[PDB]
Amino acid sequence: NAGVTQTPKFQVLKTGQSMTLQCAQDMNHNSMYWYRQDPGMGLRLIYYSASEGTTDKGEVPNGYNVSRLNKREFSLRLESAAPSQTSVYFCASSVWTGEGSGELFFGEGSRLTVLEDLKNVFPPEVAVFEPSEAEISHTQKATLVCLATGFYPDHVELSWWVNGKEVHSGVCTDPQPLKEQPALNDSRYALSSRLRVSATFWQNPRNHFRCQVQFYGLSENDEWTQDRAKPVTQIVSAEAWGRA
Amino acid sequence: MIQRTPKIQVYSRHPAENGKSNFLNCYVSGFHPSDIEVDLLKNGERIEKVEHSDLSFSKDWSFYLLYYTEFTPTEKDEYACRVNHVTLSQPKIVKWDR
Amino acid sequence: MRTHSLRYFRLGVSDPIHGVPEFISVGYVDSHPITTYDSVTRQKEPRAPWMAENLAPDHWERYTQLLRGWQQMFKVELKRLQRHYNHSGSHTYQRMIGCELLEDGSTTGFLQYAYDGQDFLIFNKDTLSWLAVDNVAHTIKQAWEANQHELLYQKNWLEEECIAWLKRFLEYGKDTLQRTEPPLVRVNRKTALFCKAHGFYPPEIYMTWMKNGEEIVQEIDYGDILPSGDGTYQAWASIELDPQSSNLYSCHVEHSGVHMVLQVP
Amino acid sequence: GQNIDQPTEMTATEGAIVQINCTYQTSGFNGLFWYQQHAGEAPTFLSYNVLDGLEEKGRFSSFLSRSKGYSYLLLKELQMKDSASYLCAVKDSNYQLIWGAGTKLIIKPDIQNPDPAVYQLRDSKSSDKSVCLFTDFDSQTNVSQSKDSDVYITDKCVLDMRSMDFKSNSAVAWSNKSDFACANAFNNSIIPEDTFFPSP
Ligand code: NA
Ligand code: NA
């Protein structure tokens, strides 16, 4: 009952590297599709499969191939990745096709960034800043701020943890990152998030706050030659305790 | 299940005149289901070079086909169409009637 | 122009003999095949030269993929019918969809299905509902009518898209579809009088016999309009002679706006 | 040349009504779809129209005029969770789905008791940054990006404290520069006259 399952969620590639994106649907649908989504444009169909046992090119097939492995599975292949293939890729399925009214069911998307050189890849620095005493006395509320800075590419997931449990109420994370140097095409990114709690909650000295950032970066088989540490997939975090 | 037997009509393309090349048509229509075999006969012998249209579909769900061959009619030669279908115990012979 | 129509047929067979396709889909404009697809070729292909010349390869490529999907859906649908009828052996499933553009400018559109060559489900695009002939059809009707959006889609396709396709194909094939070849008509004595017409196009023609200026259809034998093989048609009608009294017999033929009378002496 | 056009972005206030337009020029027409896509999430189906008229589904309605080649998606009683992109797409004569570029819908929360203020957060012993928080201002206020290359200013974010049914706008500014101060951090923004600046 999972719907459309595509992997991976994030991937960094060097120009020329190969990559396969997986997609499965458990809805017994017959038609499957691979789309790319880029800023300022409508979705563009790469390849599709109208039924098990047939596939055909969409509007932008060059640089890609597909395999309809069975009724459930439709994989997308980048044999020699190019920087122009940096995009968000969506798999979708429909019960049938060639009919007016049937809607598409989408997977969660796969964000790919293709780079000429991996020396531009950086994990985030993560820091947590405790609330202003003036805010507490003026509003009876307390805002913590988490900053994740200097990362590249924009492949991060930020979460707040209070006393060992992830929280979402009271949280606002920027929906888009800030380019630290807006003029540069490969600028590193910054991301801010806020957690706001009551003053009484912040003033309990046994309440514990953590901001955690999952960064999706390099893996074992990526070649690394820089002096700094290899920017592997990793979690970076920072914490604060309540202040009585 | 309702199976419909083929109607079989044999005719020349043009009003026939002996010694003048023509086409012999056998139009097989109204049958269901679609599997059918059709031969044109000359003096009882099966003609080899015989064309036919693709299976065609009627609005009443039956099927039809046209089988044809070029020929020159003579006074002595007898022509026929031989059709077999699931609704026929034995092939049905329809002779060309001038 | 006179009345023209566009229609697509599908045929599925559940247990076909060796070689025969499980699935066939053919389009027609008037009496002329225009398109063909089957489960053996797995390609949509033109059946008229004026279709091949006016539709770019992208058309055949796209609809080939759609037809491969429609082929599978047709198999699944037939498997469901034959299970619910509890039928063994080979059975057939058929579909016909199409539209007419009448001479006066009005339109019709239709969509229906058959099992073993008999009406099964008939679409009404004005009430947006399906007529079921038995309880297996009734089960299908209930499922299809639950998907209101797909009924609306069929109404739009019949009323708007189909008519636009038909006008497009009529222009493509205008030298064939819009021409007129008048009939050559003669009367033979064989006892019955045979009124025979050949060499005409379009195939629509009206031939009848009048006796002393009056028509009695109950004594006229009406022959079929038959293809001659060269793109034209032939037809005939007969009446039997009264041996005891003379009468004024005349054959009347109407074709493409022209009326003709052959009085027999 | 088939085209689908819809506005890039629309901004409306919580509780109000918004109409998102989509016009199309296509070779043939087999129906028009609307999808909702939350930022970083997958599109999901909202509606399908193929005959003329208005169809309702909860707080959303979708209208189509085939002769004008136009549809709108109508959202009534806007809520913050309606913030998303809305994608229109049309199936042509060949059943090709042609996608509009999407309309980003931004919703301004209704702030009942504005209390605009700029607060200095506490330094972290692990960071050289000073961090300032502009918060609790009315939704008409716009936050300008920084004009100093070593000052970073993020756009405003709407936070919901569910327990208290309380929403607030905020933006964050930071720098490691010696002359950075919260009193001047948001100087390039037009901020409310009554903004509270607590003493350093
Ligand atoms: Na390719
Ligand atoms: Na037989």
Give whole-number Cα distances, C153 to C149, C250, D184, D190, in Å: 6, 51, 60, 52
CATH 3.30.500.10 in chain C is located at 1-179
Nearest C-alpha of chain C: how many angstroms from B13? 5
Identify the residue whose tokens are 């200026």.
Answer: C213
Give CA–CA dist A72/A196, Å, rounded: 44
User: Which residue type is seen at C153?
Assistant: Y
Give CA–CA dist A48/A61, Å, rounded: 10
Give CA–CA dist C157/C155, Å, rounded: 5
DSSP secondary structure string for all residues of C170-193: HHHTHHHHT--BPPEEEEEE--EE
| Resolution of the coordinates, Å | 1.8
Does the domain spanning C1-179 belong to CATH 3.30.70.270? Answer: no
Give CA–CA dist A23/A90, Å, rounded: 9
Select the residue of C90, C114, C234 nearest B61 (Cβ to Cβ). Answer: C114
The strand pairing partners of D24, in sequence order, are D4
- DSSP helix/strand/coil, C45: strand
User: 169-188 in D: which are within 8 Å (CB) of A?
Assistant: 170, 172, 174
Q: Which class for C235: exposed (0-12), middle (13-18), buried (19 or more C-beta within 10 A)? A: buried
Answer left, alpha or beta for residue B19, where phi above 0 means left and psi between -120 and 50 means alpha: left
> Which helix (H) or strand (E) element contains residue C166?
helix C162-172
Give CA–CA dist C11/C96, Å, rounded: 9
Q: Which of D87, D91, D73, D70 is nearest to D2 (CA)?
A: D91
Identify the residue whose tokens are 């208005």.
Answer: D54
Answer left, alpha or beta for residue B61, where phi above 0 means left and psi between -120 and 50 means alpha: left
If one counts every other C-beta atom within 10 angstroms of the C-beta of residue C116, the result is 20
Q: Which of A200, A206, A193 is nearest to A238 (CA)?
A: A193
Give partners of B (≥3 CB pairs < 8 A).
C
Give yes or no for B64 touching C (CB within 8 A). Answer: no
The strand pairing partners of D13, in sequence order, are D108
- DSSP helix/strand/coil, A142: strand
CA atoms within 13 A on the CB side of A116: 2
Q: Are A92 and A35 in contact (CB under 8 A)?
A: yes
Considering only alpha carbons, which residue of chain C is nearest residue D47?
A: C149
Q: Which of B63, B30, B67 is nearest to C20 (CA)?
A: B63
Nearest C-alpha of chain D: how many angstroms from A239? 10
Give yes or no for A130 touching D (CB within 8 A). Answer: yes
Q: Which CATH architecture has domain C180-265?
A: Sandwich (2.60)
Q: Are D28 and D93 in contact (CB under 8 A)?
A: yes
Q: Which of B35, B34, B33, B36 is nearest to B2 (CA)?
A: B33
Contact D39 A42 (CB under 8 A): no
If one counts every other C-beta atom within 10 angstroms of the C-beta of residue D95, the result is 18
Q: Which of D90, A28, B61, B57 is nearest to C25 (CA)?
A: B57
Q: How was this structure determined?
A: X-ray
Which are the contacts of B87, defined by CB distance < 8 A and separation ≥ 6? B3, B4, B5, B6, B31
- C174 token code pair: 């205008």
Q: Which of A5, A2, A214 is nearest to A90 (CA)?
A: A5
Which are the contacts of B60, defined by CB distance < 8 A and separation ≥ 6? none
Give CA–CA dist C226/C224, Å, rounded: 6
In this structure, the strands spanning C4-13 and A31-37 are unpaired
User: Which residue type is seen at A167?
Assistant: V
Give whole-number Cα distances, D73 to D11, D60, D61, D85, D155, in Å: 15, 7, 6, 12, 27
> Which helix (H) or strand (E) element contains residue C143?
helix C135-145
Q: Which residues of D touch C157 (CB under 8 A)?
A: 30
Residue D186: φ, ψ to 5° = -100, 30
Contact D149 A97 (CB under 8 A): no
CATH H superfamily, domain A1-116: Immunoglobulins (2.60.40.10)
- D65 token code pair: 């005029």
Q: Are A123 and A217 in contact (CB under 8 A)?
A: yes
In this structure, the strands spanning A31-37 and A44-51 are antiparallel
Going from N- to C-terminal start, the domains of chain A cover 1-116, 117-244
User: Is the previous residue joined to C202 through a cis bond, with omega within 30 degrees of 0?
Assistant: yes
Q: Are B30 and B58 in contact (CB under 8 A)?
A: yes
First to last CA, chain A: 48
Select the residue of C62, C67, C153 nearest A99 (Cβ to Cβ). Answer: C153
- C28 token code pair: 């027609």
After which residues does chain C show a gap where C to N exceeds 2.5 Å? Answer: 190
Give whole-number Cα distances, A217 to A162, A221, C58, in Å: 26, 12, 41
Beta strands in chain D (DSSP E): 3-5, 9-13, 18-25, 32-37, 44-49, 53-57, 60-65, 70-75, 84-91, 97-99, 103-108, 117-120, 130-135, 152-153, 157-161, 166-175
Q: Which of A89, A105, A104, A77 is nearest to A2 (CA)?
A: A105
Q: Are A38 and A31 in contact (CB under 8 A)?
A: no
Q: Which of C211, C219, C224 is nearest to C252 (CA)?
A: C211
Which are the contacts of C146, defined by CB distance < 8 A and separation ≥ 6? none
Q: Are A143 and A135 in contact (CB under 8 A)?
A: yes
Give CA–CA dist C88/C79, Å, rounded: 11
Beta strands in chain A (DSSP E): 4-7, 10-14, 19-25, 31-37, 44-51, 54-57, 65-68, 74-78, 87-94, 105-106, 110-115, 125-129, 141-151, 156-162, 165-167, 171-173, 178-179, 189-198, 208-215, 234-241
Give CA–CA dist A108/A89, Å, rounded: 9
In this structure, the strands spanning A105-106 and A110-115 are unpaired
If one counts every other C-beta atom within 10 angstroms of the C-beta of residue C263, the result is 10
Give whole-number Cα distances, C260 to B44, C184, C195, C220, in Å: 41, 10, 12, 18
Angle (deg, nearest 10), helices C57-84 and C135-145: 130
Q: Which class for A11: exposed (0-12), middle (13-18), buried (19 or more C-beta within 10 A)? A: buried
DSSP secondary structure string for all residues of C113-139: EEETTEEEEEEETTTTEEEESSHHHHH
After which residues does chain D show a gap where C to N exceeds 2.5 Å? Answer: none
Nearest C-alpha of chain B: how many angstroms from C228? 5
Q: Are D16 and D139 in contact (CB under 8 A)?
A: no
- DSSP helix/strand/coil, C261: strand
All structural domains of chain B: 1-98 (2.60.40.10)
Q: Are D31 and C153 in contact (CB under 8 A)?
A: yes
